[PDB]
Design a protein around this ligand. Sequence first.
Ligand code: CLA
Ligand code: CLA
Ligand code: CLA
Ligand code: CLA
Ligand SMILES: CC(/C=C/C=C(C)/C=C/[C@@]12O[C@]1(C)C[C@@H](O)CC2(C)C)=C\C=C\C=C(C)\C=C\C=C(C)\C=C\[C@@]12O[C@]1(C)C[C@@H](O)CC2(C)C
Ligand SMILES: CC(/C=C/C=C(C)/C=C/[C@@]12O[C@]1(C)C[C@@H](O)CC2(C)C)=C\C=C\C=C(C)\C=C\C=C(C)\C=C\[C@@]12O[C@]1(C)C[C@@H](O)CC2(C)C
Ligand SMILES: CC1=C(C/C=C(\C)CCC[C@H](C)CCC[C@H](C)CCCC(C)C)C(=O)c2ccccc2C1=O
Ligand code: SF4
Lengths: 169, 41, 739, 80, 168, 160
Amino acid sequence: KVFSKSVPFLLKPAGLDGMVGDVGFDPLGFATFIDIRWLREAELKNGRVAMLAFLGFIVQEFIRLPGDLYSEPNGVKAFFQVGPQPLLQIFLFCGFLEFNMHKGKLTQVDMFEDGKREPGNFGFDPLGFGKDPAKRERYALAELKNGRLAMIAIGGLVHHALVTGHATF
Amino acid sequence: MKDFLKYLSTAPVLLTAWLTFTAGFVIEINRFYPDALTFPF
Amino acid sequence: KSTIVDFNPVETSFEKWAKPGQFSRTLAKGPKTTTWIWNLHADAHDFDIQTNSLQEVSRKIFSAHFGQLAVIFLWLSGMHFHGAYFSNYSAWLTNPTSTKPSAQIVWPIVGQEVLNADVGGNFQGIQITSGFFQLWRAEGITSEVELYWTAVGGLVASFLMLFAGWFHYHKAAPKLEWFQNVESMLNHHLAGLLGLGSLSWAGHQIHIALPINKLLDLGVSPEEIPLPYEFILNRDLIAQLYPSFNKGLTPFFTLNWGEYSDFLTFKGGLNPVTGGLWLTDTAHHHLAIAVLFIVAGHMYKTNWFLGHSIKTILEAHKGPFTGEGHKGLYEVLTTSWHAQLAINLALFGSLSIIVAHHMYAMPPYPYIAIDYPTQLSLFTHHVWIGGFCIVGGAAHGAIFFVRDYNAANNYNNLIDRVIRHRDAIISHLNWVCIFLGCHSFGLYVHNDTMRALGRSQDLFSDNAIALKPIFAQFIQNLHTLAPGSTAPNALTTVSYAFGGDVISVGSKIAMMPISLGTADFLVHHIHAFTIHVTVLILLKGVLYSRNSRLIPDKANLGFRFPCDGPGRGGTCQVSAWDHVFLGLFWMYNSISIVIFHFSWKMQSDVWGTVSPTGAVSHITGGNFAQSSITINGWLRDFLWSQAAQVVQSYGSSLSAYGLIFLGAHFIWAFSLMFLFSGRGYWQELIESIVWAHNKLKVAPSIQPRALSITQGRAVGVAHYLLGGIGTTWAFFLARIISV
Amino acid sequence: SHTVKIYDTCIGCTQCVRACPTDVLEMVPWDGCKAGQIASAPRTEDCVGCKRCETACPTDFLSVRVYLGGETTRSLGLAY
Amino acid sequence: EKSKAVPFLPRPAALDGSVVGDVGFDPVGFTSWLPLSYLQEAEIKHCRIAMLATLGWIVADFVHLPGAVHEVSSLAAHDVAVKSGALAQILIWTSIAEAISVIAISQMLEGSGRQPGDFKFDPLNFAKDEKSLKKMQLSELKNGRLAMLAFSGIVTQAALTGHAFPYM
Amino acid sequence: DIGGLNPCKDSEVFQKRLAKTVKKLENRLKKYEEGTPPQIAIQQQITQTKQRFTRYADSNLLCGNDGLPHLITDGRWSHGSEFLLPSILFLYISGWIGWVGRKYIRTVGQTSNPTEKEIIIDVPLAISIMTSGFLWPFAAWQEFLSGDLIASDETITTSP
Ligand code: CLA
Ligand code: CLA
Ligand code: CLA
Ligand code: CLA
Ligand SMILES: CC(/C=C/C=C(C)/C=C/[C@@]12O[C@]1(C)C[C@@H](O)CC2(C)C)=C\C=C\C=C(C)\C=C\C=C(C)\C=C\[C@@]12O[C@]1(C)C[C@@H](O)CC2(C)C
Ligand SMILES: CC(/C=C/C=C(C)/C=C/[C@@]12O[C@]1(C)C[C@@H](O)CC2(C)C)=C\C=C\C=C(C)\C=C\C=C(C)\C=C\[C@@]12O[C@]1(C)C[C@@H](O)CC2(C)C
Ligand SMILES: CC1=C(C/C=C(\C)CCC[C@H](C)CCC[C@H](C)CCCC(C)C)C(=O)c2ccccc2C1=O
Ligand code: SF4
């Protein structure tokens, strides 16, 4: 028996072999009954959204926009003060982005049905970082780790605002 | 735990779990926002 | 390698949990139509068709009994836990006559918190009609901590019974010879179970319930009453209430049992303080029952040259009119579980009905006679359980006749001779049923039409043509004269229902002489007629379960089959199951009439309030005597009149009873769709629905089929019973809680 | 008496004949199927209409068909 | 035959010699109908939990964390900690650890090779070869049993008599 | 206004109903003692009743002559939160349920044992299909266009 590298008292999970964040961490075996490509796509998207949202917290409490609506240093209270109209526009824009970036196939059964789709690979690289394949793997691992850390931190900041109410500081 | 998970995948257990979860979130919506006669918006 | 058990017969594995229908040879292949799903549950406990060995069936039955007892223990633990945590038992103890027992509080969701009623004692909740508070008080339980510990013990016992079932199916399963030791089983169930349970309960009553309840009746608050264990460690806390414990057990071993007359009395009547039976009388009763049952347990020969053989007893009881007599009955009852189930279920339902009668007749718990909802609920529930169990006993007798009956082994015995003249039995029972129905009901209809025609002197009433139940009144007179004449050591009659004084607790009547007039004559004959018709249906099912003039090979079609075909003019419902279906309907009718008679008679001529000068005013006002003799009277002065509380319960704490009233009406009417219709129409409608699904590519692989004819009948009867019983349940509960 | 008809979809599996409770059906030689036999109904006067014959028929929509008709003490199953 | 612990009782027939802390003590034959690895895991879990619990009870009756909520005796600390939510955090993280334990014990029972109670948690070494590991396993088992009995006595005495650290 | 109804904010009978309910609840509250849980529960009932009546008053709700909110479901967007928005919400949810059920039926209908996978659900595949129902309006008007939504003549028909 091999046993996992992360959880040393557990057997090595299956389906994670050719990935860019494999430390053998899957005690519940989510990769066995869920497609690993979909799981990586979801992890990357959740991580990127969490990173953007954490940066949004830190900037919102600091900078903010001119106007009476955009005057709440607290993100949770800003979600309510801003009203539904600005939020629904963000929702529709995110939907438009989702549709055009995945080119129609948006669901768990439709995406990766034909393969030829690296999980999380939207081809988005205008600044050109990533031409060298040597640093590409390191960049992918850094993105994954930062995304996970940002998921934890996004939960932390949101719940700090809920239990205190003032801000993050 | 290979056949136990298959037993939990049977129609009665899955229907009971799904209906319990469904009644649960319905009851909790009606607890946190009670007496909702019209759409909140 | 024990001689009674087999070790590790079945492996404890989850593999068969993932293969539904593995027990059945036909269902194991997997579902092809939706009929497979229904067949899966209809054959789950039919262990006879799952194995060909009586040993395996017996082991499955034994483990199923353990599972059932674990379920019962869990239910009891839940009841005690609710009494401990979600009840006003402590408040009810200090004010039994003014606080309504409640042991279930309702969460505040969707406005349902209105169900939390003003039961009293600074408590809100649902009023409890199961009488647990009175039972706990009779047990001497004076604190909710004791209820919590009883609940914990119940949980432990339930786990123990679950473990016992698992152990005796998978680790050490008894052999067939162990199960067939009916002599040993009877000896143990009679001495150990019954007698030693009575003895242990007598000990508990004498040492815990007798002193604690005596202190409670004396006015001592539950907080200053000593803890129950102190009544055992200290022979002076109990010797003050009963000054006979000072002599210890010496009077018992010296045969001077007269010294124990302090706490082993024979009084009769009711306790004037609580309205229940004297707990000293109860303890003496349980002691006598224990001795009698222990003696009765030393009857059958088990392992020594001592006792009786049931085979030799039965085989010696022949006669000129009965041929071989009881020869072969021992083989029938030791090789067929269905025959044992028939006898046990019939006698068990009859026992439940007898219990229901003796409950209200002689209230055995403190402050339970003045809790009218508890009395009504207990009587109705126990009578319903008795009727259901009796129908089940008839059903399993029919099942035994179809399946486990061997013609060769029963040559010219009682079973054979009964089948040989089944025609005579059924024809005479038919004539008796027609006679009884004609008379009882047509006397009712004659009263109704005489009243409708303005001829009040032509009725079958007391102020008219009178049918006095003289035989029952003679018995009532004999019982009220028994103390001092035939029961010379009695101080009071067994029940005040036979006659005597009005017993009131807190201005509420506990018991009172139940007068019998022409109204009781008619309703008693209605009871006899309904019981006779139910017996007719069930006995026709049992006797004609194997063959008939219509179908000479009905036994080859099994116990459960819809018909033999449209031929012979139509052979619907010829089974024996279709007789347990019709008998279920008629049992519902009979029990409904019985509980209606009880409710109206008690409310009109027993229950009520007593004025300080001794004037008795009842709940309804004595309208039973003159208005229960016509069907219009039953419709108006009982149904319409006492349904006022149910229909006016909306917005109050009894609104749940109105909702259940309406829902039970809905379910009862829903049943008629299955009872009146047939399978072909529903199959052909499912055909068009399946066409639509196929048109939308959503037709299930498991082909949807309409419920089988037998299952359609079963669904119809189940819904009918549920709706009717629920309607009566809501009506009774709302009416008797409001007033 | 009821009417019983046999149709050439008969596969000669004999399940109808051995299910008749009143000896109405019988197997007769034939050349329209592999078994070389076809059911016949030469004693329909004893037909009771119980339709056990077509409950045992394996062919798609039956090869033995029972049409209920005039009633008789034999067809009504009257022992009296 | 003739188990070491109870010399007049037969050997439990499931504990020959190949388990740490195996003196053949199973008079009521718990090992005759339950897996040995399952019972070993349960015993080791109890040992560790009760060792932590005894140390915490004794220490918290001496040293208190800053704050008014932490100014109660260990006997009354349960109702205070549950109200403040202190025990909720322990419950959450213990539940996470116990779900991972569900996975681990399932894998151990269905093959794998993980010894009962072996989570491979060993930042320091403290056990370099087989002999040291066996000796330290025996020490852990004996200390855990002693601490289970000690916590039992501590709780029973403290509940009987509401005394401070000397629960006499 | 619409249909002769009037807003509940100006309906006297509505306020009479509120006052009567509050008075009944307070009378019930009078028979308990101090800050005991029954009094807390009755006070919560009173607070919830007042909040519900206030919300119904300030909700563009039309009340009849009985002082009860009447629903205007003719289709006008003015009273669109009474029927139209809940109608859209239910249509979305029910279309989701039907779509995931149909997709699961068609997916396990092409396996070796289609009937087995209906009493014993393939929970991985079931979860995969169920979370994909958020696009059911788009999936339906992408399968109907391709002719994959409707069968044509393989469907069975009775004799006549
Ligand atoms: C004095 C001895 C004794 C006692 C007390 C019992 C008691 C019982 N037997 Mg039993 N039995 C005995 C001897 C005894 N039996 C013998 C010698 C045989 C062999 C012929 C059988 C064969 C037998 C069968 C085949 C069945 C029973 C069943 C039952 C139960 C009937 C259900 C009932 O009334 O609920 C009353 C319930 C209670 C009062 C609960 C407390 C009872 C507990 C469990 C004590 C049981 C005593 C037990 C025999 C002690 C053995 C302990 C074990 C470690 C050896 C009841 C618990 C039936 C049953 O329900 O199966 C489980 C059943 O199907 N018995
Ligand atoms: C000690 C009691 C007892 C026992 C051990 C049995 C045991 C048995 N009976 Mg039996 N029976 C009993 C009492 C009993 N019965 C009673 C009292 C009746 C009269 C109604 C019957 C009537 C009866 C018939 C008519 C038949 C049996 C059959 C059987 C056998 C198969 C049972 C099965 O698979 O059902 C599995 C269990 C179910 C299918 C459960 C069905 C659910 C029920 C009907 C509804 C319960 C509703 C419940 C009250 C909750 C409603 C509340 C609502 C709000 C939801 C089995 C040997 C059958 C057989 O073939 O025997 C060989 C058969 O045809 N019995
Ligand atoms: C109100 C409806 C109703 C009535 C009146 C009856 C009546 C009867 N049923 Mg029942 N039954 C009913 C509903 C009813 N049933 C339902 C819903 C079911 C479904 C489960 C059944 C299922 C059922 C079974 C399975 C059996 C019966 C049997 C009987 C008969 C018992 C013998 C008897 O009393 O005959 C006497 C007749 C009456 C009491 C009816 C009223 C007669 C009046 C009062 C006296 C005579 C009037 C006079 C002749 C009128 C002449 C004037 C006229 C010509 C103008 C009796 C005919 C049993 C049977 O066959 O009989 C033994 C039997 O086995 N019934
Ligand atoms: C079974 C384990 C256990 C449990 C349930 C508790 C529970 C409690 N302790 Mg406690 N404690 C423990 C072990 C335990 N302790 C140990 C081993 C020590 C010695 C360091 C202490 C020292 C201690 C002090 C000094 C105080 C408490 C206090 C308290 C109470 C509230 C605050 C709190 O949770 O402690 C906070 C706990 C600490 C600050 C130290 C805990 C150190 C841990 C147990 C050692 C490392 C283990 C590791 C983290 C395990 C990982 C778990 C895994 C699932 C991830 C609460 C009743 C406080 C109180 O109210 O006293 C009445 C208080 O002042 N404890
Ligand atoms: C921090 C955390 C996890 C941190 C892990 C980190 C950062 C490391 C992550 C990574 O290394 C991995 C793993 C793998 C790498 O590939 C990726 C990176 C990213 C490198 C979880 C916190 C988890 C935090 C949790 C669970 C907090 C729960 C708090 C609760 C429940 C509070 C409740 C109360 O506040 C209320 C509600 C009311 C009050 O009155 C009472 C109380 C009880 C106090
Ligand atoms: C609990 C949690 C993470 C828990 C992580 C744990 C335990 C990790 C444990 C480990 O790492 C360690 C310790 C060590 C590792 O080696 C092993 C593991 C085991 C992996 C994240 C919560 C994460 C929680 C999150 C992200 C919640 C975000 C909430 C948002 C955005 C809410 C928005 C709103 O609330 C507003 C603002 C207004 C409302 O009215 C409307 C809405 C919209 C609802
Ligand atoms: C409607 C009907 C059907 C069709 C009924 C069917 C197909 C039953 C469908 C049951 C569904 C599929 C499951 C049950 C759904 C309920 C909502 C669950 C019960 C409610 C719980 C609270 C118990 C018959 O097959 C039939 C046969 C013979 C005589 C009469 C009838 C008859 O009336
Ligand atoms: S279907 Fe109904 S009617 Fe036709 S035979 Fe069977 S039972 Fe008699």
